[PDB]
Design a protein around this nucleic acid. Structure first.
Ligand SMILES: [K+]
Ligand SMILES: [K+]
Ligand SMILES: [Mg+2]
Ligand SMILES: [Mg+2]
Ligand SMILES: [Mg+2]
Ligand SMILES: [Mg+2]
Ligand SMILES: [Mg+2]
Ligand SMILES: [Mg+2]
Ligand code: NA
Lengths: 100, 121, 144, 38, 204, 34
RNA sequence: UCUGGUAAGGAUAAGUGCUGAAAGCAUCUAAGCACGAAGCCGGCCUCAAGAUAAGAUUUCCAUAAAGGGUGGUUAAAG
RNA sequence: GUGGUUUGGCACCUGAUGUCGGCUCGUCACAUCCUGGGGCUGGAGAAGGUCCCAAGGGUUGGGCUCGCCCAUUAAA
RNA sequence: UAAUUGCUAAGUUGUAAACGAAGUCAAGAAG
């Protein structure tokens, strides 16, 4: 019941990999709330809009669906390159392959 | 401004006296016909010993309108009646004389033989 | 097919570099993009699987086509008027680099077989042969 | 082109191909034998 | 690119070939450049133009400082225009001669306000039934507003009574009859939105 | 019959293949196109 | 009474093709590449930062008239 | 085999789930009437016929009460 | 995000048939 996790900065986010034909074959559906208002989009459309939008869409969905999850998703920072400005926080480098 | 069920004078020397507009030709939901427009009519009254029979469905061209017609030069013309001229299947005058004036717009309606008219206004 | 040697003739030199392998010869310089699974010219298929075999045969055929294109080149002849000066849109049948054309018949010569085929197909797409009567662009029927 | 659930090469000259997940029968000599939807 | 204007009224004139042309008179007036927006600072290129001369009595201190920086007399109406061929600086003046080589213009205005309007005037509803033949009290009613329990809701976008007019409207491709620089006048064929004295945007 | 079809080959901007671009032009105006 | 709806910028459907193996042939396809619809995403018009991811730019900064409110004369605004 | 749109079978919900057509206002599907693109034709051309893709927008007014008739329309 | 060995390339999957083509992997028989 407490926000007790880390603040995560993801770098090199445009080099993420999707296997199979999921870059264009995975169909995301949404609705505008108007009649005849279902719309389609793809992970490619998300990535063209920006890596952070695709990453946020995926991580939400794996987070809890409540107020705590809505706050927790705000601790994720996603960047295409290696250039981010988070000095004076001294983020430590975590090897993602070490976590199991 | 002639629509379905409007009654017109027949302004030629054919047998018909009065006609009833059945349909305004030219498109879906086309409401009104003016001078130079082609309509379908039913003949309502004829003279005794008339070539055309009462109840005959025919085509006609409108030559006089009570509602006023606007010309591009800022002028307007209106008549005291609503008058048409009957046509055959080929699109030509059924008769040989025209009674009363006709609108000047009929010159450009490929209807030049209505130059039988006493006066073109 | 994909295992036969590909002899390089005199005047044509083929260099392999960074999967952008280019053959520069007498009649032009052509390029190709072999795969890691693919390796005179001697092909070498790493595995015997279906994908490896198909890729090996395809790449060997492409290399041989490149060698023939640089060395001897290719020509196609096709059968309303025609033109000689403006080789973009100058033919009259109805109304309204890297290749050479001749002056009705047309002879078109080049070094890239795919480009030559595309250009010939586009030239012949203007008027296909008519089954009703023999008419239209043809390479050098039924009663109605 | 004819669409049916059962395609067969009724003639030696007919050939069976697969294109983008569909099955076609092609015949250049006479194109009225062409079928699809294997 | 374009300029701010004021609608004067309508008249009808005669062309050279003898055609009665309806005509709207617009005072396009000298517009002064009051701000240059750039990609480096603002993120997009545009020019801000001011139209009608104001007074210090009706200029607030922030806007007074804005005009002081532009080094122009205070203006009443400000609007932004993009895709200006030719460079323009702070304080430059543009007049109705800007339209001296245009055959057609676009006019943006605010339409006349109708207030709250029913479905018949607002959306052209046909009305329920006839005036007679058993009519009780639904002559200008909307009729049904949905289907039965299966949707069990009124859809979004259902046409209903409400505020009509008093909104931004664009009229496209109005032919230009004459440019009159001596009076800052523009004559267009046809009608433009709004009442007399309303402020218009005229785009080339 | 002054109009005429004009198709010109040009390298692709995203692939690099000699694609075709076609337009109608006047008979005298073909010089500007090609 | 004026004005508008066109065309197809991009990716495609059914189809048309280039080169080409598996399968020395063939094959529009498995590697690549051209095309190809009123359909799809745009372009056009209106709204739109409570877009709580609450954005940007210019200018001014407390008391009189920095900004407002209440009030008055009113409006093609309601 | 599919659908549930016809005639049925069952009797599971119901101290009221209250009524056929027409009007008004719609909304969706595509099993496509028109308009757009294609394959085959026993397709000379022109008319067509059948099949495939395609749901954007359109898809009349009358004399009679599912249907018939009159006059249209790109289509009804 | 265990260990080992296969199969699938269809996102099949992680919760319908007569009839086609045999896409792929094995196990064979005749020739
Ligand atoms: K509901
Ligand atoms: K389940
Ligand atoms: Mg008002
Ligand atoms: Mg009424
Ligand atoms: Mg009553
Ligand atoms: Mg009443
Ligand atoms: Mg029982
Ligand atoms: Mg009860
Ligand atoms: Na599935």
């Amino acid at each position: 019941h407490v926000d007790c996790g880390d603040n995560v900065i993801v770098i090199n986010a445009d080099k993420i990999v999707l296997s199979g034909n999921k870059w264009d074959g995975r169909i995301y559906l949404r609705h505008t709330g108007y009649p005849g208002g279902q719309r389609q989009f793809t992970p490619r459309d998300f990535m063209n809009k920006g890596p952070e939008y695709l990453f946020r869409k995926v991580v939400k969905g794996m987070l809890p669906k409540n107020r705590l999850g809505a706050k927790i998703i705000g601790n994720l920072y996603v960047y295409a390159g290696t250039e981010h400005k988070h000095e004076a926080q001294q983020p430590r480098q975590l090897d993602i392959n070490s976590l199991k | 401004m002639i629509q379905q069920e409007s009654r017109l004078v027949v302004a030629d020397n054919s047998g018909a006296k009065e006609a009833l507009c059945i349909r305004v030709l030219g498109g879906t939901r086309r409401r009104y016909a003016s001078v130079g427009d082609i309509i379908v009519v039913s003949v309502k009254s004829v003279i005794p010993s008339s070539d055309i029979k009462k109840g005959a469905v025919s085509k006609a061209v409108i030559v006089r309108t009570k509602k006023e017609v606007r010309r591009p030069d800022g002028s307007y013309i209106r008549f005291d009646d609503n008058a048409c001229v009957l046509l055959n299947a080929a699109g030509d005058i059924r008769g040989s004389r025209i009674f009363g004036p006709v609108a000047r717009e009929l010159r450009g309606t490929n209807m030049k033989i209505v130059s039988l008219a006493p006066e073109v206004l | 097919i994909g295992k036969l040697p590909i002899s390089i003739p005199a005047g044509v030199t083929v260099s392999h570099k960074d999967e952008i392998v280019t053959v520069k010869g007498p009649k032009g310089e052509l390029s190709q993009y072999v795969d890691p699974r693919i390796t005179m010219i001697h092909l070498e298929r790493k595995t015997d699987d279906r994908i490896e075999r198909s890729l090996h045969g395809l790449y060997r055929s492409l290399i041989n086509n490149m060698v023939q294109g640089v060395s001897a080149g290719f020509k196609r002849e096709l059968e309303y008027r025609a033109s000689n000066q403006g080789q973009l849109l100058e033919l009259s049948l109805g109304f309204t680099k890297e290749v050479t054309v001749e002056t009705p018949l047309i002879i078109l010569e080049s070094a890239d077989k795919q480009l030559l085929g595309q250009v010939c197909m586009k030239i012949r797409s203007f008027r296909k042969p008519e089954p009703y009567k023999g008419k239209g662009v043809k390479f050098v029927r039924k009663s109605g | 082109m004819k669409v049916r659930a059962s395609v067969k090469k009724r003639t030696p000259e007919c050939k069976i191909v697969r294109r983008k997940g569909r099955l076609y029968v092609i015949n250049k000599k006479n194109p009225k034998y062409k079928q699809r939807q294997g | 690119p374009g300029l701010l204007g004021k609608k004067i009224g309508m008249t009808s004139v005669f062309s050279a070939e003898g055609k009665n042309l309806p005509c709207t008179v617009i005072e396009v007036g000298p517009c002064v450049v009051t701000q240059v927006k750039t990609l480096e600072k603002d993120g997009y290129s545009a020019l801000q133009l001011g139209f009608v001369d104001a007074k210090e009595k009706h200029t607030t201190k922030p806007l007074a400082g804005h005009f002081k920086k532009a080094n122009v007399a205070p203006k009443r109406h400000l609007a932004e225009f993009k895709n200006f061929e030719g460079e323009h600086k702070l304080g430059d003046v543009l007049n109705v001669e800007f339209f001296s080589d245009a055959d057609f213009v676009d006019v943006v205005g605010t339409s006349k306000g109708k207030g709250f309007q029913g479905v018949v005037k607002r959306h052209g509803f046909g009305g329920v039934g006839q005036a007679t033949h058993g009519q009780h009290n639904r002559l200008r009613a909307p009729g049904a507003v949905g289907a039965c329990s299966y949707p069990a809701k009124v859809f979004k976008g259902t046409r209903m009574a409400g505020q009509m007019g008093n909104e931004r409207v664009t009229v496209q491709n109005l032919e230009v009859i004459k440019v009159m620089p001596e009076h800052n006048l523009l004559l267009v064929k046809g009608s433009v939105p709004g009442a007399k004295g309303s402020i218009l945007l005229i785009e080339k | 019959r002054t109009y005429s079809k004009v198709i010109k080959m040009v390298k692709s901007p995203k692939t690099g293949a000699y694609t075709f671009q076609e337009e109608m032009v006047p008979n005298e105006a073909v010089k500007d196109f090609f």
